[PDB]
Structure formats: C-alpha cells, structure tokens
Design a protein around this ligand. Sequence first.
Ligand SMILES: *[C@@H]1O[C@H](CO[C@H]2O[C@@H](C)[C@@H](O)[C@@H](O)[C@@H]2O)[C@@H](O[C@@H]2O[C@H](CO)[C@@H](O)[C@H](O)[C@H]2NC(C)=O)[C@H](O)[C@H]1NC(C)=O
Ligand SMILES: *[C@@H]1O[C@H](CO[C@H]2O[C@@H](C)[C@@H](O)[C@@H](O)[C@@H]2O)[C@@H](O[C@@H]2O[C@H](CO)[C@@H](O)[C@H](O)[C@H]2NC(C)=O)[C@H](O)[C@H]1NC(C)=O
Ligand SMILES: *[C@@H]1O[C@H](CO[C@H]2O[C@@H](C)[C@@H](O)[C@@H](O)[C@@H]2O)[C@@H](O[C@@H]2O[C@H](CO)[C@@H](O)[C@H](O)[C@H]2NC(C)=O)[C@H](O)[C@H]1NC(C)=O
Ligand SMILES: *[C@H]1O[C@H](CO[C@H]2O[C@@H](C)[C@@H](O)[C@@H](O)[C@@H]2O)[C@@H](O[C@@H]2O[C@H](CO)[C@@H](O)[C@H](O)[C@H]2NC(C)=O)[C@H](O)[C@H]1NC(C)=O
Ligand SMILES: *[C@H]1O[C@H](CO[C@H]2O[C@@H](C)[C@@H](O)[C@@H](O)[C@@H]2O)[C@@H](O[C@@H]2O[C@H](CO)[C@@H](O)[C@H](O)[C@H]2NC(C)=O)[C@H](O)[C@H]1NC(C)=O
Ligand SMILES: *[C@H]1O[C@H](CO[C@H]2O[C@@H](C)[C@@H](O)[C@@H](O)[C@@H]2O)[C@@H](O[C@@H]2O[C@H](CO)[C@@H](O)[C@H](O)[C@H]2NC(C)=O)[C@H](O)[C@H]1NC(C)=O
Ligand SMILES: *[C@@H]1O[C@H](CO)[C@@H](O)[C@H](O)[C@H]1NC(C)=O
Ligand SMILES: *[C@@H]1O[C@H](CO)[C@@H](O)[C@H](O)[C@H]1NC(C)=O
Ligand SMILES: *[C@@H]1O[C@H](CO)[C@@H](O)[C@H](O)[C@H]1NC(C)=O
Ligand SMILES: [Br-]
Ligand SMILES: [Br-]
Ligand SMILES: [Br-]
Ligand SMILES: [Ca+2]
Ligand SMILES: [Ca+2]
Ligand SMILES: [Ca+2]
Ligand SMILES: [Ca+2]
Ligand SMILES: [Ca+2]
Ligand SMILES: [Ca+2]
Ligand SMILES: [Ca+2]
Ligand SMILES: [Ca+2]
Ligand SMILES: [Ca+2]
Ligand SMILES: [Cl-]
Ligand SMILES: [Cl-]
Ligand SMILES: [Cl-]
Ligand code: NA
Ligand code: NA
Ligand code: NA
Ligand code: NA
Lengths: 263, 263, 263
Amino acid sequence: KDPQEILLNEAFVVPYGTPLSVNFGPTVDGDFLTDMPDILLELGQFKKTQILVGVNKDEGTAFLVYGAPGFSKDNNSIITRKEFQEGLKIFFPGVSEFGKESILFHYTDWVDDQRPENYREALGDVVGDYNFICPALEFTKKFSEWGNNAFFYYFEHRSSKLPWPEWMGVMHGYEIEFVFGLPLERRDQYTKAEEILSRSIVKRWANFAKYGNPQETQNQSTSWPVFKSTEQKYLTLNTESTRIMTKLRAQQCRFWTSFFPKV
Amino acid sequence: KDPQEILLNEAFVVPYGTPLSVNFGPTVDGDFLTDMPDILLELGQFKKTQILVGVNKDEGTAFLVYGAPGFSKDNNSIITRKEFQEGLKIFFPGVSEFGKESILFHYTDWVDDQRPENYREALGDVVGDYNFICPALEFTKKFSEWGNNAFFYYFEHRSSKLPWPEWMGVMHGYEIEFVFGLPLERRDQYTKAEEILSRSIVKRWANFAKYGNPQETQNQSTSWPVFKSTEQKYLTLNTESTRIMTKLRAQQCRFWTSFFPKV
Amino acid sequence: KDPQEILLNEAFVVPYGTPLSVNFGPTVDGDFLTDMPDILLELGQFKKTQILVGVNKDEGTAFLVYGAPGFSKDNNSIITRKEFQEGLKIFFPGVSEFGKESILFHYTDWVDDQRPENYREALGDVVGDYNFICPALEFTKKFSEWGNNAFFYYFEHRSSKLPWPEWMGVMHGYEIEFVFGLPLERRDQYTKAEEILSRSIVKRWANFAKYGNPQETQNQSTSWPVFKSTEQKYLTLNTESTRIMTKLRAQQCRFWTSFFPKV
Ligand SMILES: *[C@@H]1O[C@H](CO[C@H]2O[C@@H](C)[C@@H](O)[C@@H](O)[C@@H]2O)[C@@H](O[C@@H]2O[C@H](CO)[C@@H](O)[C@H](O)[C@H]2NC(C)=O)[C@H](O)[C@H]1NC(C)=O
Ligand SMILES: *[C@@H]1O[C@H](CO[C@H]2O[C@@H](C)[C@@H](O)[C@@H](O)[C@@H]2O)[C@@H](O[C@@H]2O[C@H](CO)[C@@H](O)[C@H](O)[C@H]2NC(C)=O)[C@H](O)[C@H]1NC(C)=O
Ligand SMILES: *[C@@H]1O[C@H](CO[C@H]2O[C@@H](C)[C@@H](O)[C@@H](O)[C@@H]2O)[C@@H](O[C@@H]2O[C@H](CO)[C@@H](O)[C@H](O)[C@H]2NC(C)=O)[C@H](O)[C@H]1NC(C)=O
Ligand SMILES: *[C@H]1O[C@H](CO[C@H]2O[C@@H](C)[C@@H](O)[C@@H](O)[C@@H]2O)[C@@H](O[C@@H]2O[C@H](CO)[C@@H](O)[C@H](O)[C@H]2NC(C)=O)[C@H](O)[C@H]1NC(C)=O
Ligand SMILES: *[C@H]1O[C@H](CO[C@H]2O[C@@H](C)[C@@H](O)[C@@H](O)[C@@H]2O)[C@@H](O[C@@H]2O[C@H](CO)[C@@H](O)[C@H](O)[C@H]2NC(C)=O)[C@H](O)[C@H]1NC(C)=O
Ligand SMILES: *[C@H]1O[C@H](CO[C@H]2O[C@@H](C)[C@@H](O)[C@@H](O)[C@@H]2O)[C@@H](O[C@@H]2O[C@H](CO)[C@@H](O)[C@H](O)[C@H]2NC(C)=O)[C@H](O)[C@H]1NC(C)=O
Ligand SMILES: *[C@@H]1O[C@H](CO)[C@@H](O)[C@H](O)[C@H]1NC(C)=O
Ligand SMILES: *[C@@H]1O[C@H](CO)[C@@H](O)[C@H](O)[C@H]1NC(C)=O
Ligand SMILES: *[C@@H]1O[C@H](CO)[C@@H](O)[C@H](O)[C@H]1NC(C)=O
Ligand SMILES: [Br-]
Ligand SMILES: [Br-]
Ligand SMILES: [Br-]
Ligand SMILES: [Ca+2]
Ligand SMILES: [Ca+2]
Ligand SMILES: [Ca+2]
Ligand SMILES: [Ca+2]
Ligand SMILES: [Ca+2]
Ligand SMILES: [Ca+2]
Ligand SMILES: [Ca+2]
Ligand SMILES: [Ca+2]
Ligand SMILES: [Ca+2]
Ligand SMILES: [Cl-]
Ligand SMILES: [Cl-]
Ligand SMILES: [Cl-]
Ligand code: NA
Ligand code: NA
Ligand code: NA
Ligand code: NA
C-alpha cells in the first residue's frame, strides 16, 4: 500500500475516537515490553535510578477545542451543564452512564458562587486529571516506593507569547520552550521574568542530568525536596515564587486512581 | 486637666512618631507584667494552653497612606527608589543609616522584571513583616516549643466590599468582619464565596473555643495541622482553596528576627 | 616573551589587588574542573573518602603588615577606628560601602573594656575568618554531609622560635614545621613541650594517612571525634591540653557564609 492509504485509514480503525485517541501505540509485545506494564511498576521491575516528573496546571484544555461542544479558541467557551454532559460523552465514549455520572458528581460540587465558567473549568480538569496529572503522580509514588529519589514539579506559568486564548491557561506542551531555553534569547519578546524562569529550569534540568539532583544552588533558590510516599512534596515552577507544596490533586486523584478504574 | 488637654498633647510626648506609634502602651509594671515579656516567652513562663494565631497577606499597606511620600488611597502609588528610601526614614526614624540600608538591601533584590510597582510593594512588605507577620510567627514558634498545640493561619482574601483601593490588597483589620460572620447576612452584598468562607471561619473559631481544635469537620475541609517548630505548617484562608503551606516568610523573618534587632 | 616580562606584569592584570590577590589561579576549564566547584561540593560530586581539615588561631595577621595602614611587624600596631575602616578598604576593594559597614558592624561590638588592641585584633579576625576559617568549616560540613568521616583541628600554639612579633599570634603557615617534625630535632632550640606537641601531631597525621583515623592511641591522649553536621566537634592542638570543642566561630561564620555573599 501507498503510505497515504495507510494514513488515510488510521482514524477509522476504531468505532469512535476522541481527541485523545491513540489508535496505534505501544503494546505488550513480549520483546520491548515483557508483561503488562502496570504489573512491572507495581512489582518493582524497572531500572533503579532517579526520576524527575511533572505536569502543567491546565493539561486538559488543549483537547477541548477539538470537539467538545460549546468550546472555541475564539471565545470564552462559557458552557452549560448540558454541554458538560455532552463533553463527557465525547471524552468517555465506551463508558457506562453510571461511570459518566460519577465524573459529573465528583467535578460539579461547587465551591460555590455561580460562576459562569464552572462547567468550562471542570471539563478541562476532568480531562487533564484523568489523562495526565493523576497517572504521573501515581507513577511517581509507585516508582519512589522502591527506594529511588524522585522529584515532582507543577508548572504553572502561562507563556506571555501563548497564541491560544487565556481561558486555556497553562496548557499542555507549553513548558517545553522553557525547558529548551528559548526565553534566554532576548531578541524573542519573552518578558524578563520568563528569561529568569527558563534559566533556572535549564539549570535544574542540567543539574538533574549531571548529578541526579535538580537544584539551582547559587541563587538562594527554593530547595527541591524528593517526592516520597506519605509526604508527596512537589515544587511549583512559576515566575513569581517557587513553593514547596504537598499532595497535588489529592481528592481528584483518589477518584481517578481508586474508583474510576472499577467503572 | 480637662481630658481634652491630655488628648491634645499625647502625640507630642515623643520627638518623632510614625504612623505606627504607640505613645502610651503596656509597660513592665511589676504587677500585670512581672518581667520583660521577651524573657517570659523565651523561658516558658506563660499559661500552658492551645493558641490560634494568624496574619493577613498585606498587613503593612494600611499604614503607608498615613505619611509615606508618593502614597495615596486615590491613585496606584507607583513610587520611586528615592520615595522608598524616604519612606524608611518615615517608618524607622531612630534607626541608623546602616540599619535602613540593610532593609533596602533585603527588600530590593528583584525578581526581576522592572515592574513599576516594585518599590510600592516592598514598602508595604517591610512594614507588614516587621510589625506584624514575623513577630506573630516568632511568638507562635516560641510558644509551641513548650509543648502546647498552636495553629497558624494566613488570611489572603480581599473583601469584595473593601473601600480602600486594590493596590492595598488584603489589609490589616479586614479579616475581622469574616470572623464575626458579617458575610452570613445575605442582605449585605458580599459574594456567595464570601458567605461560605465566613461560615467556615466562624465554625473553625467556634470549634477552637469549644474543643481547642479549629477544624471544620463536616464539609470535606482541609485539615488544619498544628504549627510545630521544624515544620511550621500553616493554613491559608481564601475563597478558592485552603492550602497547607510551610515556613511563611522564611527569608524575610530571618532578617527581622535575627539580624535587625542588632542594628 | 622573556619569563621576566611575564612576571613583571602579573601584578598589574587587575585594577586593584590586595595582599591576598591570586591573579592567576584555578579556573573552571572543563577538563581538570568540570563545573563550578561550589556546585560539585553542594551536590556531592567528589571522591568519597576521609578528610582531615584545620586552621590556625590567627590566620589573618600575616597579611596585615603587607599594606593595612598603622600595622607593622616592628611595633604593636595599636590602630584606630579610622585605620580599621581604611584597612577594610584595602582588603575589600570591590565591595560596596554597605558591604564594608556590615563587616565593621559584625566585628566591632565589644565585649567591652576599651582595650586599645580592639581594632587591631578585629582586623586580623576579619581577614582570617573570611579567607580561611569559615570556608574550611563550610567545606568540612558539606563534605561530611555525604557520609564520610571528617576530622577538624584548631591549631593554637605559637612557635617559641617565631620571628614575627607577638601581636600576630598563631600565624598562618606556622603549624607546618610541627607537621614535618622539625621540633623533634633537639639541636634546634624548640622547647620540650613543642617536641611533644610535634611528635603527637606527626603520629596523628601518620595514623590518618595509614588508617584514616588521626588518633594517638598509646599515650592517654584525647580522642579526636569525627566532625559531623549538627555537633561540629573539633580538636584543639596546643602545648598544654588538647580539648574537644564545638562550633568554631559559629557567630562569625554565619555572617561570612550566609550573609556576606549577598552583599
Ligand atoms: C463559542 O463558539 C462556539 C463554536 O462554534 C462557533 O465559533 C464561533 C466563534 C462562531 O464563529 C460560530 O458561528 C461558530 O459556529 C459556539 O458554539 C456553537 O454555536 C451554535 C449555536 O449558536 C451551535 O449550534 C454549534 O453547534 C456550536 N458549535 C460547537 C462546536 O459547539 C459557542 O456558543 C460560542 N460561545 C460563546 C460566544 O460564548
Ligand atoms: C498619588 O498621589 C500623591 C499624593 O498627593 C496627592 O493626591 C493626589 C491624588 C492629588 O490630589 C495630588 O494633587 C495630591 O497632592 C502624589 O504625590 C504628591 O505629588 C506632589 C508632586 O506632584 C508632591 O510634591 C507631593 O508632596 C506628593 N504628596 C505626597 C504625600 O507624597 C503622587 O505623585 C500620586 N501618584 C501617582 C499619580 O501615580
Ligand atoms: C607602627 O609603625 C607604623 C608603620 O610605619 C612605620 O614603621 C615604624 C616602626 C617607624 O619606622 C615609622 O617611621 C614608619 O613609617 C606607623 O604608621 C605610620 O606612621 C606615620 C605617621 O607617624 C603615617 O603617616 C604612616 O603612613 C604610617 N605608615 C603606615 C604603613 O601606615 C605606626 O603609627 C606605628 N605604630 C605605633 C608606634 O604604635
Ligand atoms: C473492533 O472491530 C469492529 C470493526 O468495526 C469497524 O469496521 C472497521 C473496518 C472500521 O471502519 C470501524 O469504524 C468499524 O467500527 C467494531 O465493530 C463496530 O461496532 C459497531 C457497534 O458498536 C457495529 O455497528 C459494527 O460492527 C462496527 N461499527 C460500525 C459503525 O459499522 C468493534 O467495535 C471493535 N472492537 C472493539 C472496539 O473492541
Ligand atoms: C525624651 O525627652 C526629650 C524631650 O523633648 C521633647 O519635649 C517634649 C515636652 C515634646 O514636646 C517633644 O516633642 C520634645 O521632643 C527628647 O528630647 C528631644 O530631642 C531633640 C533632639 O532629638 C532635642 O532637640 C530636644 O531636647 C527634644 N526635641 C525638640 C524637637 O525640641 C528626647 O529625645 C526623648 N528621649 C527619648 C526619645 O528616649
Ligand atoms: C579588566 O579590564 C580592564 C583593564 O584595565 C587595566 O588595563 C590593564 C592592562 C592593567 O594595567 C590594569 O591596571 C588596568 O586597570 C579594567 O579596567 C580598569 O578599570 C578602571 C576603573 O575601575 C578604568 O580606569 C580603566 O579601564 C582600568 N583602570 C586603570 C587604572 O587604567 C577592568 O576593571 C577589569 N575588569 C574586571 C576587574 O572585572
Ligand atoms: C543567578 O543570578 C545571576 C546574577 O544575579 C543571573 O544573571 C543568573 O541568570 C542566575 N543563574 C541561574 C542558573 O539561575
Ligand atoms: C457545610 O455545607 C452545607 C451544605 O452543603 C453548607 O450550607 C454549610 O454552610 C456548611 N457548613 C460549614 C460549617 O461550613
Ligand atoms: C608517648 O610517650 C613516650 C614516653 O612516655 C614519649 O617519649 C613518646 O614521644 C610518645 N609518643 C607519641 C606518639 O606521642
Ligand atoms: Br441532570
Ligand atoms: Br542609592
Ligand atoms: Br563612623
Ligand atoms: Ca490549580
Ligand atoms: Ca502537543
Ligand atoms: Ca526560587
Ligand atoms: Ca504573598
Ligand atoms: Ca484597624
Ligand atoms: Ca476547604
Ligand atoms: Ca580564639
Ligand atoms: Ca606562607
Ligand atoms: Ca592529649
Ligand atoms: Cl500535608
Ligand atoms: Cl518545607
Ligand atoms: Cl554545643
Ligand atoms: Na449548576
Ligand atoms: Na531599580
Ligand atoms: Na546584614
Ligand atoms: Na570605639
């Protein structure tokens, strides 16, 4: 077959995809992957070494404008309860009615003013928590339980140059330019605070690679504590002030991690 | 003397006051107070019981519009370095030139964009840290070292009704209406999120008084941890989400607490 | 170039030197030294082995007679406040006025009789603490935090043969002859107590080299405890009686180590 015919049919190998569909991805092949990877993680079968793991404050927003009803990069996407409900059907197509209601129940207890953006924000958090943030924290816990140092970050800076609208916040993929040091180029119109945030992340990443410890030792920076089971300390990355926090998304991730897999 | 003549002369009993002057206040009288109170605190001579202690995010701002040059409730008070320097002279009149420079040095290392509000914000933090926040945290540490449970809060909600301008932020005195439950009165035009914040603070205060433990046990609230030496956990009070944090103003309070008293 | 022309111009490659100038010294070359050495120390990137570290009681005095005003090997060098101030300008040429005042402030709070030698002694301690003693103790702490045994000494014996005047005390470089065992030669006019001090130091050094433990095991000597973070025990070397002490120069080194680098 022409490579085009293979590409043109990839989308259709599944009866219904979502904006998050991975139609052709890693499998347990008995070669690269010897067993179901959840089993290897749980039972400590992996390379013993240090890890650095993190997520962005609004992981799920990018996906909402690829098909969730009432969303748009070109307006504020204030959506209704009905739209939220439709959006779950878009993101959780094989899931039972009870499964989808349990998501609605966990995410729509406000908190409290009404707050036209309530449903818009909840849908981004559903998608970001389920797909990115809770699995990263779960991976980090299970990995650290076998004795290795782990460092966890929560990136919460929105790029001053971001072409996506404000409501989408600190999107998926938008720490990358900070990690590769693009704001170090003064010719590029990033702010001065961003040049500093990038320089510091660049140094922490490089110190991690060289020394297994993502500290910035020279500028009176906040010390990055290891992420342990029990305390679960993480470092926030922002332009203002680095903070040590604990138990990112504790209540949300209990939902996705212990209850949702049963549904 | 007529009480008016006493009142009219009170301001002048001091060669130079500041907006923070307490001309006639508590003294060591050998009766109510048997010794210098710093000595009693340090050496554990006080009632052994639980305490609840807290401060507001912008304690020092209220005082700046009573005489610091370039400040005004009726504009944004963007002040210069020269004005900041003059402002220290207004707030630290008996203090040596070196003392005042040490304050300038500790507070003016930015952090980094310039940031026209840099000096305005620093002066509010100088006043709030020196006068309210570091002494409260120091009191809380020394008190808890003698074995009693202590709970510390950082109030960071600006009242939607605040008549003072925005730059003054979460001012001194403006948690009080939340503590006395004024936002519980729906007729009063506080937001719904404020009614909820107040109800929860009212419950924590009442639980503290009745049970020595300022928890809100029924609504899945963040648990308020005791403030201990070493970890120094505190609870943030805000309309969005209560957080447990550590070592409020660590770098600033090291300055005021260990170095400034020598100057 | 003739080697003489290179030598003759070395002094001038810098706009102002001090008696402590190292115009051509180690650099981070990417070969011998792979990174800034403060970063390697802090992040534990060094050979894991035992160390023996020490300093002399008056490290800074030797340097004062190479240019500090009012100092002389040929009189008692009783200097004034003005001379002390001038001396800081000689030793801290690139340093801000505030930086130099902070040194004056930390070192001139007496303690208390006046004490004509006050300023003379303070200037020697400024130079010795900044340049030798606090960096050695800081090196020893950071090295020991990674698990290796460290032993720290404070040499406080003035050689009976010292050609420098008394006020200079236990100078920089004047333990060396004790370490190489020159006082073991009875023909040399060192005292008997010095022969014994040298014999014991020679044995401790040799036991350190052979066995990693600088004990003198046969003569009822004071046991030399490992220097740990937290307790910071060190051994004094003197002709009278060896003592175990703690936290050499604690107050001074807090100044140089945590505050001065900011200035
Ligand atoms: C934000 O826009 C959406 C997305 O679709 C629209 O893009 C707009 C910027 C505009 O060009 C519009 O014409 C275009 O269709 C709006 O939702 C859409 O609105 C109609 C009804 O008016 C629905 O029937 C559409 O199906 C729906 N599209 C999708 C993909 O849901 C949305 O209402 C708007 N929100 C605002 C203005 O707050
Ligand atoms: C904010 O206002 C201050 C405070 O004083 C002023 O109040 C203003 C709202 C206005 O009515 C003004 O006329 C009144 O005096 C301004 O600082 C003042 O400005 C003058 C020079 O223009 C100084 O000589 C005054 O001494 C000074 N007063 C004080 C108490 O410092 C301030 O500049 C202004 N800031 C702005 C607009 O950003
Ligand atoms: C200790 O001596 C110094 C150093 O300079 C001097 O050495 C002396 C032993 C003597 O030979 C003297 O003539 C020689 O200059 C004295 O300080 C010097 O004194 C003069 C003023 O009298 C100053 O103008 C010099 O600049 C100054 N030299 C330096 C390098 O500072 C010092 O006063 C003396 N102290 C005593 C006796 O207590
Ligand atoms: C995997 O196998 C079948 C295959 O059905 C598919 O045929 C493909 C070639 C492709 O075009 C795809 O879109 C189509 O869905 C799946 O069966 C589907 O299930 C529905 C009901 O859900 C039935 O109507 C059909 O058999 C078929 N769908 C359509 C629209 O024709 C089957 O769901 C899947 N197995 C899984 C997901 O585990
Ligand atoms: C306490 O005692 C004196 C008293 O001086 C004061 O006289 C009062 C009745 C009152 O009006 C007050 O404003 C006035 O200051 C203080 O002496 C002052 O110090 C200055 C120099 O700082 C001198 O000029 C005067 O003696 C006097 N000031 C003025 C403006 O006339 C003294 O400072 C104080 N003691 C303290 C603060 O410890
Ligand atoms: C490194 O570069 C310049 C070089 O200046 C020097 O020229 C040398 C060849 C040598 O003779 C040396 O003594 C001379 O200082 C330094 O510039 C100096 O700074 C001063 C002001 O501080 C200026 O007047 C001159 O450019 C020069 N000094 C003199 C006396 O002529 C520069 O300071 C230095 N860079 C550093 C220290 O980081
Ligand atoms: C540290 O601070 C300097 C000067 O204050 C700054 O220019 C540099 O970017 C900083 N280095 C890192 C790694 O953040
Ligand atoms: C707890 O929740 C209820 C109902 O959800 C609410 O009305 C009440 O204000 C809350 N009580 C406290 C003490 O916060
Ligand atoms: C130990 O003591 C002996 C005899 O009392 C003495 O001569 C010798 O110098 C000492 N040895 C050491 C290593 O100090
Ligand atoms: Br419904
Ligand atoms: Br200045
Ligand atoms: Br002076
Ligand atoms: Ca958040
Ligand atoms: Ca992407
Ligand atoms: Ca930092
Ligand atoms: Ca703050
Ligand atoms: Ca008030
Ligand atoms: Ca809560
Ligand atoms: Ca001494
Ligand atoms: Ca020498
Ligand atoms: Ca001995
Ligand atoms: Cl916690
Ligand atoms: Cl912490
Ligand atoms: Cl001790
Ligand atoms: Na609703
Ligand atoms: Na500036
Ligand atoms: Na200081
Ligand atoms: Na004096």
